[PDB]
Every structure is written in structure tokens, then in C-alpha cells.
Curated annotation (Swiss-Prot), chain A:
Primary site of residence: nucleus
A GO MF label: DNA binding
Compartments reported by the entry: Nucleus; Nucleus, Nucleolus
Keyword terms of this UniProt record: Acetylation, DNA-directed RNA polymerase, Host-virus interaction, Isopeptide bond, Nucleus, Transcription, Ubl conjugation
Keyword Phosphoprotein part of the UniProt annotation: no
Gene3D superfamilies: RNA polymerase, Rpb5, N-terminal domain (3.40.1340.10), RPB5-like RNA polymerase subunit (3.90.940.20)
One Pfam entry name: RNA_pol_Rpb5_N
UniProt-recorded name of the protein: DNA-directed RNA polymerases I, II, and III subunit RPABC1
Disulfide bond positions: none
Cross-link named Glycyl lysine isopeptide (Lys-Gly) (interchain with G-Cter in SUMO2), sites: K80
Native species: Homo sapiens (Human)
Family matches, as HAMAP family: RNApol_Rpo5_RPB5
GO cellular component, one term: RPAP3/R2TP/prefoldin-like complex
Described purpose of this protein according to its UniProt entry: DNA-dependent RNA polymerase catalyzes the transcription of DNA into RNA using the four ribonucleoside triphosphates as substrates. Common component of RNA polymerases I, II and III which synthesize ribosomal RNA precursors, mRNA precursors and many functional non-coding RNAs, and small RNAs, such as 5S rRNA and tRNAs, respectively. Pol II is the central component of the basal RNA polymerase II transcription machinery. Pols are composed of mobile elements that move relative to each other.
From Swiss-Prot, chain B:
Tissue: Expressed in the brain, in the cortex and the white matter (at protein level).
Shown part of the complete sequence: 1218 to 1376 of 1390
Disulfide bonds: none
Organism the protein comes from: Homo sapiens
Compartments it resides in: Nucleus; Cytoplasm, Cytosol
Oligomer status and interactors: Component of the RNA polymerase III (Pol III) (Pol III) complex consisting of 17 subunits: a ten-subunit catalytic core composed of POLR3A/RPC1, POLR3B/RPC2, POLR1C/RPAC1, POLR1D/RPAC2, POLR3K/RPC10, POLR2E/RPABC1, POLR2F/RPABC2, POLR2H/RPABC3, POLR2K/RPABC4 and POLR2L/RPABC5; a mobile stalk composed of two subunits POLR3H/RPC8 and CRCP/RPC9, protruding from the core and functioning primarily in transcription initiation; and additional subunits homologous to general transcription factors of the RNA polymerase II machinery, POLR3C/RPC3-POLR3F/RPC6-POLR3G/RPC7 heterotrimer required for transcription initiation and POLR3D/RPC4-POLR3E/RPC5 heterodimer involved in both transcription initiation and termination.
Protein name: DNA-directed RNA polymerase III subunit RPC1
Swiss-Prot record, chain C:
Subcellular locations according to the entry: Nucleus; Cytoplasm, Cytosol
Subunit organization: Component of the RNA polymerase III (Pol III) complex consisting of 17 subunits: a ten-subunit catalytic core composed of POLR3A/RPC1, POLR3B/RPC2, POLR1C/RPAC1, POLR1D/RPAC2, POLR3K/RPC10, POLR2E/RPABC1, POLR2F/RPABC2, POLR2H/RPABC3, POLR2K/RPABC4 and POLR2L/RPABC5; a mobile stalk composed of two subunits POLR3H/RPC8 and CRCP/RPC9, protruding from the core and functioning primarily in transcription initiation; and additional subunits homologous to general transcription factors of the RNA polymerase II machinery, POLR3C/RPC3-POLR3F/RPC6-POLR3G/RPC7 heterotrimer required for transcription initiation and POLR3D/RPC4-POLR3E/RPC5 heterodimer involved in both transcription initiation and termination.
Protein's name in the database: DNA-directed RNA polymerase III subunit RPC2
Part of the whole protein covered: 1015 to 1074 of 1133
UniProt family annotation: Belongs to the RNA polymerase beta chain family.
Lineage: superkingdom: Eukaryota
Gene this protein is translated from: POLR3B
UniProt-annotated binding residues for DNA template strand: R25, S26, R32
Mutagenesis / variant outcome for changing R32H: In CMT1I; affects RNA polymerase III assembly; no effect on nuclear localization
UniProt-annotated binding residues for RNA: K5
Swiss-Prot record, chain D:
Entry keyword set: Acetylation, DNA-directed RNA polymerase, Nucleus, Phosphoprotein, Transcription
Molecular function GO terms recorded: DNA binding; DNA-directed RNA polymerase activity
Subunit structure: Component of the RNA polymerase I (Pol I), RNA polymerase II (Pol II) and RNA polymerase III (Pol III) complexes consisting of at least 13, 12 and 17 subunits, respectively. Pol I complex consists of a ten-subunit catalytic core composed of POLR1A/RPA1, POLR1B/RPA2, POLR1C/RPAC1, POLR1D/RPAC2, POLR1H/RPA12, POLR2E/RPABC1, POLR2F/RPABC2, POLR2H/RPABC3, POLR2K/RPABC4 and POLR2L/RPABC5; a mobile stalk subunit POLR1F/RPA43 protruding from the core and additional subunits homologous to general transcription factors POLR1E/RPA49 and POLR1G/RPA34.
Effect of Y10N: In a breast cancer sample; somatic mutation
Species name: Homo sapiens (Human)
Compartments (UniProt record): Nucleus; Nucleus, Nucleolus
Keyword Acetylation carried by entry: yes
Protein name: DNA-directed RNA polymerases I, II, and III subunit RPABC2
Name of the encoding gene: POLR2F
Taxonomy, superkingdom: Eukaryota
Phylogenetic placement of the source organism: Eukaryota, Metazoa, Chordata, Craniata, Vertebrata
Full-protein interval shown: 51 to 126 of 127
Length: 209, 159, 60, 76, 174, 45
RNA sequence: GCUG
DNA sequence: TTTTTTCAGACTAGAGCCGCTG
DNA sequence: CAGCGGCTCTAGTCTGTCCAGC
């Protein structure tokens, strides 16, 4: 191979840039739009392009709210990630005082490591992504509508317009792929823009629960 | 005639892998298993397959149908978080009242289990208002009726 | 033959156990408005008709 | 006033049904009925002349309510 | 068996005066029935409520107005916009109003092509008066067409309390 | 305190009522073979 | 068992 | 002491299994 | 070198199968 392996490290990085841009992290358009040949210039074959430390990204910063708010995208070399890899990742995050990270695992994650991400801290939140999910940006898939994470001042209008409580809205799971993509948590509302058969649009709403 | 194009139809279930193999354009790959789609592409794409794969199999057999019926059946089936198929099991995750579940299958377990919990059900729907002889809130019952007869909140007498 | 298949019941014998009408023309019978008939009435939206047919004219 | 101006089919059926029961129980008839011996026929005649003494209270799901007079609602 | 299972899950659903289909619990399955808020039975055009071309033809034949101006092109679009913005039609969904304008724009385009092909009216005075009958729309017809379309749309709205869920379950089963 | 976490409503019921000590014999209106079973239970007692 |  | 007489189906426990997880 | 986490697996089991009419 080596042609195929670099292709993944370009598409995954491109999708990770697209996810960060959608989540509101600040990624330059040059990072967002890249070509495999341009990627080859930074690194070419599987030896020179190393998944563990070469592609790690702490560049993303939440420009909208906090310049300090930062996200680390970590790709572990080992196919299944143990707590030991997670503990090394946590220590790097603890020193920098960064509170969010993405871990991009290649085949999976061992069960005792998965349990750690629930309870390591509420103030140190890490999201597992399999790389096989990142080879295709689901927000550009033809069956997935536009999702828009609503502000609290807009949720307060939704519930006022219909005279609802929150627990009467339709639900969306946190384990939902598009919920993971935007990184939303319980009690956020997503606006969903479904396309009509005509030129028009229908607007619907869901609650994360 | 103008363009001859090849699309490979795969019989199988791993949509995530078959939408990543180099050369398969994931953006337009689709499936006929709502469970596979729901796991890989959110709930809202799982709503659109339940619309599509019913409206695909209904026009295949002749049998025209409005989409507004399927737009309701899909939207009921996926409105509580996950796709809740209409079986005996999906009714438990859809309804709160006991007698509507108890008039359906598993009448023994659904009545004892709701006695184990102290289940206060209100009497609503139609599967309970028909059982308890109370007029249903659906249809004619939604609106109450008033008499325009000569009346007024009158003044009292001086005491 | 239509002569043997013609049955009509107004107020007649009611079974002791449930106080509902009988099930046989010979016993004076009474017709069963079953779930499928009940479902069609729910679709029509007729709340009063269901109450009259299933409670007043059966076992109130 | 947010609710639809047009009277719904369900509303017409109930208004006629209550009015017919009221007429069948010796209520005053405001239509000067001519040769009518059936309460439902008399009730339908009253609706056409828009002289039925009933107010429809429409309850919104939250619990708020709006009252519409039978005459005010358009009959299709 | 399938019909019993469907009717034992969708029976509680009913449309409400707020226009939102809701469960007995009060949970919102939908915010508008079928997005549009229209009722499947009232549709006259394959899931679309009006089928405008047929409605205009009925109007032209039922009320064929002799001794009327029969003006067209710029006047047709001007009359339509004035009628659309007259207190009523605000209630009509905005998407419906745009669809009427698209149909009216098409009618105006058809009149222009025919008028150019067979002597454009200089001011309505051309000599073979049969030529005016080629695409004749008169002002009374335009007023009748727009009212009939508003009433047909308003009457096509699903009535609140329609037992929407029960109808869908029976409709899937048949 | 531990009856709520057993998910039992204390007003409706409590854990002991699950095991049987007395059986209410049905009203005779509801039985114009259940009666035969009751006689067998009486004989067994 | 047959009709519906 | 000696035959079967529909066909699935998506729940509920066990049996492990191997490997990191200490 | 030892352990418990999830797995993963096979079977197990109870649950249905149109309306009614004679």
C-alpha cells in the first residue's frame, strides 16, 4: 500500500477539520481544504507519516467563546486503546489545562478503557471516535438533514411558542452519530431542517436525552 | 445511452464498512435496514428510511398511498429517542397507561407488573375509555359544549 | 337460504356471567361489534356512537 | 382567536346531536318548524338559520381555552 | 394481526387546535401534520391540494365573461399581486401564496407568446376580434380563481380532533 | 426507607403482601371449575 | 365441518 | 416401559473467552 | 499471575397467527 494509508490520514484529518469547524473550533481554510498531494508534502509513506504523534492536533480553539478553550485530537498507534494510553493522554491534557480531547482509535477500545472515559472526570471529557466513522463526513450525506444546535434564548422561545415543557419534545440519543459529531449533551436542543419534496423546508426539534 | 454507469449492489449488513471502502462514495450509499441506518446515520435518517422503504415497497405492489400517512407512522415510530418498532415490545416503550398495554398482548405480566409498581394511570386514549365507558378525548370529545341560554353573573342583595 | 339466515334482536336474553347479549340466533343472539368495527368508529371520530353501542346497548 | 374560523365536522356533529336531544326533551324551537316530526331534522334546520343556543369551548393542549359561538363559526 | 398491532399504537394520536399532533401523554410526535398541515383525503392533485390548471379552466368556462376588458401580461400580474395582498391570504401558508404566483406568472408568459405569434394587441383594438379569444382571461375570472383557491386550501386543512393516528393505521393496513 | 428503592409504591403495596397468607374467595356472581379448584384448596388445607 |  | 401431528422471534438468563488491568 | 469487564454465544422460552356467523 502506502498510497491507501496516506489517503486515510488525509480524509480523517479533513473530516476532523470539518467536525471542528462545525463544532465551532477555529480551523484555517487551508487546513479545511487540502489535497492528498499537499498532505504528501507534510508526510508521504506510512513510515514518514506516523499516526501517534505526527498528526496530533491541539490547534483547534473555540474562537467564538474562549481562546483558551482548546481541543486535542489524538490518534493512538495501537489498534485497541488501553487505560494506559488514555492515562498518557490525560497527563498531557492535565499539564496544558485543556479540558476536551478527541481520541481517534483505529480498530476499537478495550472495555476497561471505555469505562474510564465515563468517570475520569466530568471536567475532563474525552470522546471516542473510530477512524472508520471519520472516513465519511455524515453531515454531507444525502440522508442526513442540517442539524443546528439551538441557543438557550431560542429554546426558551420554542417552549413559549407551543407552551411546552422540555420533556414533551421528541428525543435524540447522545449515542447518536450526529449527536457525537456535534458533541452535544443532555438538555441541549437541536433544530433539524428537513427538506421538502418541493423547494420548501420543514423545521422540527429534538431534545437530547 | 448517453452515459453507461455502474453501481454495485451488495447483499449484506455492515453499512459503516461498505460506506468507507476506498472508491465507494459514502455520501450516496444507502441501506434497507432501518436498524443499520439508525446506528450509522442518526435518528433523522432513520426516519427518512422508514418513510422511503415503506413508500418504496408500497408503490412496488401497485397500492398507492399518501405520504402523509407514512409521514405519521414514521414520526410516531421514531419520536422517543430511538426507533421503536410496533411490536409487543415497542408498545411498552411508547405508552404509559396499563389497560392500553393490557388490552394488547401479554395481559398477565402487564397487569401484575403494574400492580407491583403503584401505577396510577389516568384514563385517556381510546383503549381505556372504551373499556371504562368514559367518552374519548379524540374526535367529538376534544371540544366541550356550552349553553348560550339567558344567564349572567348577577348583582347580589344588600345584607 | 335467506329464511334461515335472517336474524334480528332488540332487547332479549342476556348471559348470566357477563350480562351481555347471547351469541346464537337460536338463543336470540345479538351481533358482536368487534375490535375492527370499533377501530373504524374511532377513525370516524364518533365518541358518542362508541359509548352508545358498547355500553348503553350492550352492558351498562 | 388563533383557532380556525371554520367549524370542524366533529363540532357540527356534536352541536346537532346535543341540540336534537334538547329539542327531543321539549326545549323551545327557534326555527318555526313546518311539518317536522324528527328532532335531528329540526336541529339541522336550526343550524342553517344560525339560531342554535350553544357555545363551543375549544381547549388548547396547554389548558388555555377560547369560546366560539355556533353562529360566529363559518359552516361549510 | 398487523392492523390490530398498528391500531393499538396509533389510536391515541389526534390533531389539536394548536395544529400539533400529540400523544395522550402530551408528548409531541409532530408539530404540524405532514409538515404542510393539509389532510390526505382533501388533496385533488397527487398529494398536492389545488391542481391549479384545472381550477382556472372551470372558472373560465363557468363564468365566461363577454363584454369584459380581457387585458393580459403586465395587467394580469398586477391584478394578481393586488388581490393576494388584501387582508385574507395572510392566513394562507406563505409557500401556497408563492405557488399561486408561480402559476399566474406562467399564465402571463403563455399569453405573451400567443399574442406575439398572432398580432400583439396594440391596445386591445386588433381587427379580427376572434384573435382576442386565443388566451382570454378577464378580471372577474382572476378574482374568482383566487378566491376558489383560498377556500379550497382552507377547507383542505386537517380539522383538529381528526383522530389522525387511527386513520393512518387503517390506511396502512388496507 | 428501602421499600422505595425496591420500586414498590408503599401506599399501593409492600414487600410482604407478595407472599400468600389469605386468599379472597371470589364473589359467587363471578362464578355461576374455579369453584372446584377452591374446594380442592380447602381440602388440601 | 362448512358458509359468509 | 412405546412417535410427531407449524413457524419464527427477539427477549432472558447461564456457559465460557481472552486479554488487558491491575 | 491474577482478576472481572465486556464480550459472545447458543440455546432456551413464551408469544402470536382476520372478522364473524350458523
Amino acid at each position: 500500500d502506502d498510497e491507501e494509508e496516506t489517503y486515510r490520514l488525509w480524509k480523517i484529518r479533513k473530516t476532523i477539520m470539518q467536525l471542528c469547524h462545525d463544532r465551532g473550533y477555529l480551523v484555517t481554510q487551508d487546513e479545511l481544504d487540502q489535497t492528498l498531494e499537499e498532505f504528501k508534502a507534510q508526510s508521504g509513506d506510512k513510515p514518514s507519516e506516523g499516526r501517534p504523534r505526527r498528526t496530533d492536533l491541539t490547534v483547534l480553539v473555540a474562537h467564538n467563546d474562549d481562546p483558551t478553550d482548546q481541543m486535542f485530537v489524538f490518534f493512538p498507534e495501537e489498534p485497541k486503546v488501553g487505560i494506559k494510553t488514555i492515562k498518557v493522554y490525560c497527563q498531557r491534557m492535565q499539564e496544558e489545562n485543556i479540558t476536551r480531547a478527541l481520541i481517534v482509535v483505529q480498530q476499537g477500545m478495550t472495555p476497561s478503557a471505555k469505562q474510564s472515559l465515563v468517570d475520569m472526570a466530568p471536567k475532563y471529557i474525552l470522546e471516542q471516535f473510530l477512524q472508520q466513522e471519520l472516513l465519511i463526513n455524515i453531515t454531507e450525506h444525502e440522508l442526513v438533514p442540517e442539524h443546528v444546535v439551538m441557543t438557550k434564548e431560542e429554546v426558551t422561545e420554542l417552549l413559549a411558542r407551543y407552551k411546552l415543557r422540555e420533556n414533551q419534545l421528541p428525543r435524540i440519543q447522545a449515542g447518536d452519530p450526529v449527536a457525537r459529531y456535534f458533541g452535544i449533551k443532555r438538555g441541549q436542543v437541536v433544530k433539524i431542517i428537513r427538506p421538502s419534496e418541493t423547494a420548501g423546508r420543514y423545521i422540527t426539534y429534538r431534545l437530547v436525552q | 445511452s448517453g452515459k453507461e454507469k455502474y453501481k454495485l449492489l451488495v447483499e449484506g449488513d455492515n453499512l459503516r464498512a461498505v460506506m468507507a471502502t476506498h472508491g465507494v462514495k459514502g455520501t450516496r450509499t444507502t441501506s434497507n435496514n432501518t436498524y443499520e441506518v439508525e446506528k450509522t446515520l442518526g435518528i433523522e435518517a432513520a426516519r427518512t428510511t422508514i418513510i422511503n422503504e415503506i413508500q418504496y415497497t408500497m408503490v412496488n405492489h401497485g397500492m398507492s398511498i399518501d405520504r402523509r400517512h407514512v409521514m405519521l407512522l414514521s414520526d410516531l415510530m421514531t419520536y422517543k429517542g430511538e426507533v421503536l418498532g410496533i411490536t409487543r415490545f415497542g408498545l411498552a416503550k411508547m405508552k404509559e397507561s396499563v389497560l392500553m398495554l393490557a388490552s394488547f398482548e401479554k395481559t398477565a405480566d402487564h397487569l401484575f407488573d403494574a400492580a407491583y409498581f403503584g401505577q396510577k394511570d389516568s384514563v385517556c386514549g381510546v383503549s381505556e375509555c372504551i373499556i371504562m365507558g368514559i367518552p374519548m378525548n379524540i374526535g367529538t370529545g376534544l371540544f366541550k359544549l356550552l349553553h348560550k341560554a339567558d344567564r349572567d353573573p348577577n348583582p347580589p342583595k344588600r345584607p | 337460504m335467506v329464511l334461515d339466515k335472517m336474524h334480528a334482536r332488540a332487547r332479549g336474553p342476556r348471559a348470566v356471567l357477563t350480562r351481555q347479549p347471547t351469541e346464537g340466533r337460536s338463543r336470540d343472539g345479538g351481533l358482536r361489534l368487534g375490535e375492527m368495527e370499533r377501530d373504524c368508529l374511532i377513525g370516524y371520530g364518533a365518541s358518542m356512537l362508541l359509548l352508545e353501542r358498547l355500553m348503553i346497548s350492550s352492558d351498562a | 382567536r388563533i383557532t380556525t374560523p371554520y367549524m370542524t365536522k366533529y363540532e357540527r356533529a356534536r352541536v346537532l346531536g346535543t341540540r336534537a336531544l334538547q329539542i327531543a326533551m321539549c326545549a323551545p324551537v327557534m326555527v318555526e318548524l313546518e311539518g317536522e316530526t324528527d328532532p335531528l331534522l329540526i336541529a339541522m334546520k336550526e343550524l342553517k338559520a344560525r339560531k342554535i343556543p350553544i357555545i363551543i369551548r375549544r381547549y388548547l393542549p396547554d389548558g388555555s381555552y377560547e369560546d366560539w359561538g355556533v353562529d360566529e363559526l363559518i359552516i361549510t | 394481526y398487523m392492523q390490530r398491532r398498528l391500531v393499538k399504537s396509533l389510536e391515541d394520536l389526534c390533531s389539536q387546535y394548536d395544529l400539533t399532533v400529540r400523544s395522550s401523554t402530551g408528548d409531541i410526535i409532530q408539530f404540524i401534520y405532514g409538515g404542510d398541515g393539509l389532510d390526505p383525503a382533501a388533496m385533488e392533485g397527487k398529494d398536492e391540494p389545488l391542481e391549479f390548471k384545472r381550477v382556472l379552466d372551470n372558472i373560465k368556462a363557468v363564468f365566461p365573461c363577454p363584454s369584459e376588458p380581457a387585458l393580459s401580461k403586465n395587467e394580469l400580474i398586477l391584478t394578481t399581486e393586488s388581490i393576494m395582498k388584501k387582508s385574507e391570504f395572510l392566513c394562507c401558508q406563505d409557500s401556497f401564496l408563492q405557488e399561486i404566483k408561480k402559476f399566474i406568472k406562467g399564465v402571463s408568459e403563455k399569453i405573451k407568446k400567443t399574442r406575439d405569434k398572432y398580432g400583439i394587441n396594440d391596445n386591445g383594438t386588433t381587427e379580427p376580434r376572434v384573435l382576442y379569444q386565443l388566451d382570454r382571461i378577464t378580471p372577474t375570472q382572476v378574482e374568482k380563481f383566487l378566491e376558489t383557491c383560498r377556500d379550497k386550501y382552507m377547507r383542505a386543512q386537517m380539522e383538529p380532533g381528526s383522530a389522525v393516528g387511527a386513520l393512518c393505521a387503517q390506511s396502512i393496513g388496507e | 426507607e428501602d421499600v422505595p428503592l425496591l420500586l414498590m409504591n408503599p401506599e399501593a403495596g409492600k414487600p410482604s403482601d407478595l407472599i400468600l397468607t389469605r386468599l379472597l374467595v371470589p364473589p359467587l356472581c363471578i362464578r355461576p371449575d374455579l369453584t372446584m379448584k377452591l374446594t380442592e384448596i380447602i381440602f388440601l388445607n
